[PDB]
Amino acid sequence: QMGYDRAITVFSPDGRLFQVEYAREAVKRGATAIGIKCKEGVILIADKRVGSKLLEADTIEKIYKIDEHICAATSGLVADARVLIDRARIEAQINRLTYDEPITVKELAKKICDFKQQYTQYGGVRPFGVSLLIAGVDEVPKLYETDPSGALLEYKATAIGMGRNAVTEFFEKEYRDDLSFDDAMVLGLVAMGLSIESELVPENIEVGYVKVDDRTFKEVSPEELKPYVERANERIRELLKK
Amino acid sequence: QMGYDRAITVFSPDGRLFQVEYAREAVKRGATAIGIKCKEGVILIADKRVGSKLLEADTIEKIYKIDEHICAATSGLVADARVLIDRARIEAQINRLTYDEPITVKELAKKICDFKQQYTQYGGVRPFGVSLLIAGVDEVPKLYETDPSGALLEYKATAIGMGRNAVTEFFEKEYRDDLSFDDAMVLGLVAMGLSIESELVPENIEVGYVKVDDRTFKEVSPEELKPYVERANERIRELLKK
Amino acid sequence: QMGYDRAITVFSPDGRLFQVEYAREAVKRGATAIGIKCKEGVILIADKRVGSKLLEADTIEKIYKIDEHICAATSGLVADARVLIDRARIEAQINRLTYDEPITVKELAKKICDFKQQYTQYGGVRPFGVSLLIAGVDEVPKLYETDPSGALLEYKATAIGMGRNAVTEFFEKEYRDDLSFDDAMVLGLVAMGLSIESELVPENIEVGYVKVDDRTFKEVSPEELKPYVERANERIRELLKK
Amino acid sequence: QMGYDRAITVFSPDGRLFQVEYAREAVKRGATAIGIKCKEGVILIADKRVGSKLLEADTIEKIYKIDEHICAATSGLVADARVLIDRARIEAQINRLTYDEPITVKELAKKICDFKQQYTQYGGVRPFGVSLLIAGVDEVPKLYETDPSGALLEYKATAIGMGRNAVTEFFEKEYRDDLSFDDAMVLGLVAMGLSIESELVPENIEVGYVKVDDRTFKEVSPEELKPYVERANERIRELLKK
Amino acid sequence: QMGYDRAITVFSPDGRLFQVEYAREAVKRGATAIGIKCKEGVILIADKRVGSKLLEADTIEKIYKIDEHICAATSGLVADARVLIDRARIEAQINRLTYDEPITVKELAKKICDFKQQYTQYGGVRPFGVSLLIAGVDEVPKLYETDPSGALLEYKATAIGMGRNAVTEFFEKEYRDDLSFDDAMVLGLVAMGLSIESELVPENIEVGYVKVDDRTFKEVSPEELKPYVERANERIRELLKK
Amino acid sequence: QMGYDRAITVFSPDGRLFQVEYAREAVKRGATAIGIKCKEGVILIADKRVGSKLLEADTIEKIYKIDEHICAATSGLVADARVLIDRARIEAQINRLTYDEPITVKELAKKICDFKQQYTQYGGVRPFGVSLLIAGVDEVPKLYETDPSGALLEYKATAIGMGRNAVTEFFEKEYRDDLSFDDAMVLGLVAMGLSIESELVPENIEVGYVKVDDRTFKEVSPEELKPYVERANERIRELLKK
Amino acid sequence: QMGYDRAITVFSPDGRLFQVEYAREAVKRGATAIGIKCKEGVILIADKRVGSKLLEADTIEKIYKIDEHICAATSGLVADARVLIDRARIEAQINRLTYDEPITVKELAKKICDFKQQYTQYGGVRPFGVSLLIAGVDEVPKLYETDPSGALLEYKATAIGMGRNAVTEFFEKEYRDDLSFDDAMVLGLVAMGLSIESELVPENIEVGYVKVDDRTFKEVSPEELKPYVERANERIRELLKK
Amino acid sequence: SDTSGDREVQRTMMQLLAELDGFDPRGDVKVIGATNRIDILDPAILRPG
Amino acid sequence: SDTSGDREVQRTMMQLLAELDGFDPRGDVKVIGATNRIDILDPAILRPG
Ligand SMILES: [Mg+2]
């Protein structure tokens, strides 16, 4: 069509970089991951449906620990995602190293923005195709979204991947500021069932969370998940009937 | 002319860098930021307006302090701003390290611009995709606009981004050189309203300023944005009644 | 055309990498490999049945000892395997150099992928069009497939190479997660037998395993292999009569 | 042409490097800078109008100080103007560092040409898209024009930019060496009148000059400009009665 | 045309990346060399027919000492051969420097494959368009083919270049593992005979061997090669009747 | 022709480099420079002709001094000359560093043609596109033309430039090895005056010369050209009537 | 052909390197240089033919001293040959330094072939378009021809350049293997005479040689060319009439 | 960012668009469109009325 | 914008112009006529009369 997407360095007259927009469209062909922030914690949900009976049930399993109160989920290239996750970990331990200071969620998110923006600007390489959901409780719970470019955006609930568009609409209706942990855990599960268009069972999700009180990363176990699933699936069914 | 636009090592036969022309269109696919100069200081306002309520507008920033008497606003990619303000912060401070002197507005504007020129010499790096407005008081107020091309121009009222055209027509009629602090502030707010085409809400605008009298940067909360935003909004209503 | 596929630092308008999607098929162009996980170890089976009587029966090899207790198979281009497994082996002993720790199966593959991430991002170098399956017992058996892109998938049974598609189907009905070591060993072979469409002779196919009692790489010579093969060959016959 | 102009490396059938001569077209668009030599010093006159009247056009500025008897005016990119002037500044102070001599007009010009030229021969980097005139009296008036190519042509009067065309055709008739300090300052001011096609205001213009009997760069304040501007305004108007 | 063999950093959709299979076609065009493995040694044979009486009938060489127990023979460019043969001789010695162990044929082979792959993987440099036969007796006779891809293939007996297919067929029938040094030597002289569709005279072939009961390289003297050839010619003639 | 001129690496099919061909046109666009060597010295004369009276009395500089008794003069791109000559001076100083001898013209010429050769090899850096005639008296007079290609050629009377062809034809008849010092330099003025197609005056030619009998380079004043010019006009006139 | 000749990195599906062959078409543009190797010495004869009578006959030569008992000729670019052969001097020197044994003609050839070989592999820099004839005597005479690839071919009678095809035909017919130094010398004058297609004058040719007994390089004076040339002219005239 | 073939399509396209509104209140000209999806159709044919 | 396409259309256009005020009158016309662009229009029809 043109050659403004034949290079990463080359702007279009529209003002855009289509090469980045096609790193956007690398995200969307990875499956759904959703983060929900409440006034009590931040709760991070990611698909674990992808696979087969053949494969492990704990096949990727996106919700890797970055710090003891920072977890980060992915959508996009599971390749591109792992180095950024491992860099994410290294950036979190540097903050501790050099200050003996629990890593601020906002500042780690900054450091990821800087890290990818070197790969964006530089044309002997390409930018990452992955969007990470950065979440943790510094002493207030936070959820951010980092883009292929390295663009920082603050959210209070968001999703990334193919499931993004369905869920954005869903939270605009249901999401509220009076919400709580317990209520958030059910909401975020409903929204994950919309994305996959089918009902949840406790083993086809992983859910991580950083509470404000504990201020530790904790996984929800399959046994704890089952009752949140029962409650979630109630609305899943309704919104998938016509 | 076709194909003199897919490198930045390349001038076109008409004389002009169209590559740079396409780098000034990224600013305009960003959100407006207006700066207006008064005798009593320098005021910097920026469109924190966000397209939804799942993002939290307050935290998404727009306008950052750079030095203790210089502030700066961005328009363009969030991403490119992160590299550029981190550049800025380090440079402003590097002056204090080897001269013990808070950086001069001209001089910072210049050093950021030399950074931006260097990314415009080499074809190996994508030129910046933002513009900053650099507003502080050194000993006198100065209000610059840096250009993605890595050029600096002194202005006494300026904008960057999509509203650039409208704020020029506005300040062409109503700008005076004899304005006070309260009047300048009001005038800048009115102007931002034209650009978004709608009223101001305290919660989606950020204003930061540096007075000559005080030489300390201070940031306007939503609480204190309130008096100014009633007075501005009446004028916007009248002006956009026509 | 299509692609946007002569550079690896350019994404397709789908958002995909044509270059990597193309390099995925070179694994397939090369010879089959069958990995199978059971609950009493992990068996990796590699196709070494290739060419006429002009070649030796040993054709290297295709099932390298990576570590004491970790092995890998290869399918795809040999040249690319030669260097990949070189790095793999050196990293396995490097963990013991810095930790005196037998490397986990999991971490070893993650870093096989991490090397390959670098040759996917940087356009100064080709992707490796080769896939290793990584079988060992850290202290539980685990089976991974590493991908050219650097995507990483845990299996509990798999095929790669020529039989990749065929054998996925074989195992939907046949493969369970309640198989014995012996059963599994015979079933990975039936499937291998399925791939070439012929009776297997153990004098040109190489099988290794790591058990959970053992925690050591062992290799099955053809005299030993004979009874396994004899129970496979009845079933390969049953299949090719329907 | 075509294809002998979309790189720096390429030579055309003419022998010209059209890339470099297209960065002389970058100069050519915006604005007059005038140099005029005389036998009682050298006077360097430059444009300083920039855009509308929001822009402060009483600063930014072509006539940069470079030594205590060296000044240059710029035409072309503002972006390139800052780095080239800065290098120029570096090279001047290297002569003081190392010889405890202010550098000669000839040698500074000679050097800064070589610097632009280094960058011409390298590919993947371009030459600078700016042109200077190097004005000084070492012990003798000199006036140079240093080219974006990195060539050196000494003149006794020239102009670069938009006004190049007007001032050449004017200086055919008028220019002589019998000019003094005064006759030259007014005569180059007329020259510039013709170039922008209007009468002069000492607000939108700026003059620096290097006199033999002071051996100083001095920068003329607008009150001091004004007497000379009166002399010139009558001449410029009679000549716009064509 | 293909567009997948512009650089080695491109892949085909076929998986058979064309630019290294065009490094393969470079080999084929080159003139023949055959490796014949027996139980009493290995024998290795290569062209020396090249040129007329302008050219030397003592042209050095195609039959390289690599060690005093390892030989190598080639096809493809003798230019690409030269640098590679150089590296082989140092590398082999490098094993000796740091172990004081004779490098085995298998280990030597894997290292030249690794060297080849440095040039194969990088896109700012082309592969060597040369193939190698490595023949030795470490203490078991061994024969490998190393591809211009730097891929490793083991053979009972093998040939490369223009006569590859004729020899291939020749040993298909006749080759056995029960051949003695005499039998296998004369058989490979028949096969070389066929390749050039002509008789053998002792100056068109250079022939070397690594013996089991000495494990040292020795080159057969011109008049010492004359009785093998004398018996071979009988047979080459029978078959060129056909 | 096409595609063999887009870098200096590529050769065309005849074995000609079309990039290099365009570099001789680069010599030929520029001003004529003639060298005439005699037994008693070597005289180097170069065109100082200006298209305006607004260029300097001596425009700097057509004939460089590059060592005690070694000079060169330029034709072709005069931008590249500044760098080329910066280097030529240094190389001739260098030999005076490391053997403390006056460099011979030949070895000086070799070294500068290596510096071209360096930019010819690399395809990143475009080659020199200017030709110099380096002239000096060592053991005996010597005169070279060093070409853009990185070749030296020795001549006994020479030319390059616009006038190149005309002065090859002239000396073919007129030059002889019986010419005195004076009869030679005068003969080059005749050569130069045909070339411009005008009578010569001192301000449109630049002369230096090299004496044997002083063993030193001198640069001849415009005043002391005046007698020779007078002598020259008669022959030029006759030639311009033919 | 068509992009598979426009970079050196490429291959063609012919399996040629078309770029190298074009580099060899460079060898054939330049003039003939011819060598004979006899048992009592080695003979080197170069073209010194001048294009004009203003060209100086002294250097336009091919023949370079390299070692006390090694000379050589070149064909190709002038520029490439002097840099390449100054490398062969160095290389000969290195050998003398570190082993204290003057370099054999064979070893030299392998070393300088491998030097051309880094430039053939690399994409960032072109190969030289030169062939050499490396002639010397170590203990007994040696003669090698270097290809533009870096290929190394041993010869006893050889040519490069333009005149080459006829010299190939010539040494088929005429040359004998019982000939002395004197008799083979004349024959090479008839062969140079053939290629230039006139009866030689001994001022358009140059002879260097190395005898075994002398074990030196000499260069044949005009006095000393004449008996060979007169003898030659007699047989040369006969081939230009028949 | 333009293309040459698109220029054709658009000068055609607007005359499609024109007629569709065009039927005077005298005469009843009803139409039934069909398309692959709205994902390949411009805003100006997706326009109300 | 397209080699055959501007020139073909440019001909229909330059005819239409002759009758408008080329030598030839209004004729009590009273034109009236719609567009949505002003950039694609020749300067010749653009001016008044
Ligand atoms: Mg209508």
Element of type H or E holding F95: helix F78-98
- Chain E residues whose C-beta sits inside 8 Å of any chain C C-beta: 3-4, 6-17, 110, 113-114, 116-117, 120-124, 147, 149-158, 168, 171-172, 175
Element of type H or E holding A237: helix A222-238
Strands of the C33-38 sheet, one edge to the other: C157-160, C33-38, C41-47, C205-211, C217-220
Residue in F closest to D147 by C-alpha: F79
Q: How far is it, in rounded angstroms, from Cα A65 to Cα A77?
A: 18
Residues 6+ apart with CB under 8 A from A224: none
Helix (H, G, I), strand (E, B) or coil at G105: helix
Residue in E closest to C84 by C-alpha: E114
Q: How far is it, in rounded angstroms, from Cα G203 to Cα G208?
A: 14
What is the number of CB-based contacts under 8 A between chain A and chain H? 7
Instruction: State which approach was used to obtain the coordinates.
Output: cryo-EM
Helix (H, G, I), strand (E, B) or coil at D6: coil
Q: How far is it, in rounded angstroms, from Cα D121 to Cα B221?
A: 54
> B45 is written with which tokens?
């306002």
Contact D96, D115 (CB under 8 A): no
Q: How far is it, in rounded angstroms, from Cα B122 to Cα C25?
A: 37
Closest-CA residue to B161 (of B220, B60, B81, B233): B81
Q: How far is it, in rounded angstroms, from Cα B236 to Cα F173?
A: 90
At residue A61, φ and ψ (nearest 5 deg) are: 80, 55
How far, in Å, is the centroid of ligand 1 from the Cα of H21? 7
Interior angle at CA D219, CA D216 and CA D225, nearest 5: 130
Closest Cα in chain B, distance from residue A183 (Å): 17
C-alpha torsion sign, points B22, B25, B30, B34: positive
C-alpha torsion sign, points D82, D87, D88, D90: positive
Closest Cα in chain D, distance from residue F139 (Å): 33
Count how many Cα atoms sit within 13 Å of the Cα of residue D156 in the half-sphere of its side chain.
23
How many other CB atoms are there within 10 angstroms of residue F101's CB atom? 9
Q: How far is it, in rounded angstroms, from Cα I49 to Cα I37?
A: 20
Q: How far is it, in rounded angstroms, from Cα A85 to Cα A96?
A: 17
Closest-CA residue to G166 (of G138, G183, G190): G190
Chains that touch A (3 or more CB pairs under 8 A): B, C, H
Which chain F positions have a beta carbon within 8 Å of G86's beta carbon?
110, 114
Interior angle at CA B31, CA B25 and CA B34, nearest 5: 100
Closest-CA residue to B212 (of B108, B109, B138, B155): B138
C-alpha torsion sign, points G136, G138, G139, G145: negative
Max CA pair span of chain H: 42
Contact A108, A91 (CB under 8 A): yes
H3–chain A Cβ distance below 8 A for any pair:
yes
Which chain F positions have a beta carbon within 8 Å of D23's beta carbon?
none
How far, in Å, is the centroid of ligand 1 from the Cα of H5? 24
Residues 6+ apart with CB under 8 A from E171: C54, E36, E156, E157, E159, E187, E191
How far, in Å, is the centroid of ligand 1 from the Cα of C97? 80
Contact A60 C152 (CB under 8 A): yes
Contact E5, G11 (CB under 8 A): yes
User: Residue D175, Cα to own-chain centre: how many angstroms?
Assistant: 17
Q: Where are the alpha helices (DSSP H) in E122-240?
A: 164-174, 181-195, 222-240
Which chain D positions have a beta carbon within 8 Å of F77's beta carbon?
15, 17, 151
Q: How many residues are recorded in chain H?
A: 49
- According to DSSP, residue G180 is labeled -
Residues 6+ apart with CB under 8 A from D106: D138, D142, D144, F60
Residue in H closest to A5 by C-alpha: H1
- According to DSSP, residue C238 is labeled H
Chains that touch G (3 or more CB pairs under 8 A): E, F
Q: Looking at the partner chain, which of E1, E50, E125 has a beta carbon nearest the beta carbon of G123? A: E125
C-alpha torsion sign, points C166, C170, C171, C175: negative
- Chain B residues whose C-beta sits inside 8 Å of any chain A C-beta: 3, 5-8, 18-19, 21-23, 25-29, 52-56, 59-60, 77-80, 82-83, 86, 119, 123-127, 129
Residue appearing with tokens 């800078």: D33
Q: Where are the alpha helices (DSSP H) in D45-180?
A: 78-98, 105-121, 164-171
- Start-to-end CA span in chain F (Å): 39
Residue appearing with tokens 């190797």: G37
Q: How far is it, in rounded angstroms, from Cα G184 to Cα C126?
A: 55
Contact G130, G148 (CB under 8 A): yes
Q: Where are the beta strands (DSSP E) in C18-140?
A: 33-38, 41-47, 63-65, 70-76, 130-137
Helix (H, G, I), strand (E, B) or coil at C173: helix
Helix (H, G, I), strand (E, B) or coil at G216: coil
Q: Where are the alpha helices (DSSP H) in G133-209?
A: 164-173, 181-196
User: Residue B219, Cα to own-chain centre: how many angstroms?
Assistant: 15
Contact E15 C30 (CB under 8 A): yes
| Residues forming a β-bridge with F76 | F130
Closest Cα in chain D, distance from residue F118 (Å): 12
- Exposure b/e, E81-115, CB count within 10 A at least 16 = b: bbbbbbbbbebbeebeeeeeebbbbbebbbbbbeb
I5–chain H Cβ distance below 8 A for any pair:
yes
CA distances (Å), origin C38, targets C135, C179, D8: 11, 6, 63
User: Residue F27, Cα to own-chain centre: how many angstroms?
Assistant: 11
Count how many Cα atoms sit within 13 Å of the Cα of residue G28 in the half-sphere of its side chain.
13
What is the DSSP secondary-structure string of A173-219?
HH--TT--HHHHHHHHHHHHHHHHTS---TTSEEEEEEETTT-SEEE
> B26 is written with which tokens?
């990224």
H4–chain A Cβ distance below 8 A for any pair:
no
Residue appearing with tokens 């096969």: E191
User: Residue E161, Cα to own-chain centre: how many angstroms?
Assistant: 9
Cα torsion for E91, E94, E96, E102, to the nearest 10°? -20
Max CA pair span of chain G: 56
| Residues forming a β-bridge with E215 | none
Q: How far is it, in rounded angstroms, from Cα E151 to Cα C32?
A: 17
How many other CB atoms are there within 10 angstroms of residue I36's CB atom? 6
Contact C104, C95 (CB under 8 A): no
- Resolution, in Å, please? 6.9
Q: Looking at the partner chain, which of F14, F113, F155 has a beta carbon nearest the beta carbon of G56? A: F155
Contact D22 B15 (CB under 8 A): yes
How far, in Å, is the centroid of ligand 1 from the Cα of H16? 10
Q: How far is it, in rounded angstroms, from Cα C96 to Cα C104?
A: 11
Which chain I positions have a beta carbon within 8 Å of H7's beta carbon?
1-2, 5
Q: How far is it, in rounded angstroms, from Cα C120 to Cα C9?
A: 8
Interior angle at CA F64, CA F59 and CA F66, nearest 5: 160
User: Residue B192, Cα to own-chain centre: how many angstroms?
Assistant: 12
Q: How many residues are recorded in chain B?
A: 242
Q: How far is it, in rounded angstroms, from Cα A46 to Cα A62?
A: 6
Helix (H, G, I), strand (E, B) or coil at D70: strand
- According to DSSP, residue D73 is labeled E
Rounded (to 5) percent helix, strand, coil in chain A: 35, 25, 40
Q: Looking at the partner chain, which of B11, B114, B147 has a beta carbon nearest the beta carbon of D129? A: B11
Residue in E closest to G2 by C-alpha: E1
How far, in Å, is the centroid of ligand 1 from the Cα of H13? 13
Helix (H, G, I), strand (E, B) or coil at D196: helix
Q: How far is it, in rounded angstroms, from Cα F48 to Cα F61?
A: 9
Interior angle at CA A36, CA A33 and CA A41, nearest 5: 130
Strands of the F41-47 sheet, one edge to the other: F157-160, F33-38, F41-47, F205-211, F216-219
Q: How far is it, in rounded angstroms, from Cα D137 to Cα D131?
A: 20
- Chain D residues whose C-beta sits inside 8 Å of any chain F C-beta: 3-4, 7-17, 106, 110, 113-114, 117-118, 120-124, 147, 149-158, 168, 171-172, 175
Which chain A positions have a beta carbon within 8 Å of C149's beta carbon?
77, 79
Contact G164, G154 (CB under 8 A): no
Which chain G positions have a beta carbon within 8 Å of F158's beta carbon?
54
Contact F155 G54 (CB under 8 A): yes
Q: Looking at the partner chain, which of C5, C79, C125 has a beta carbon nearest the beta carbon of E151? A: C79
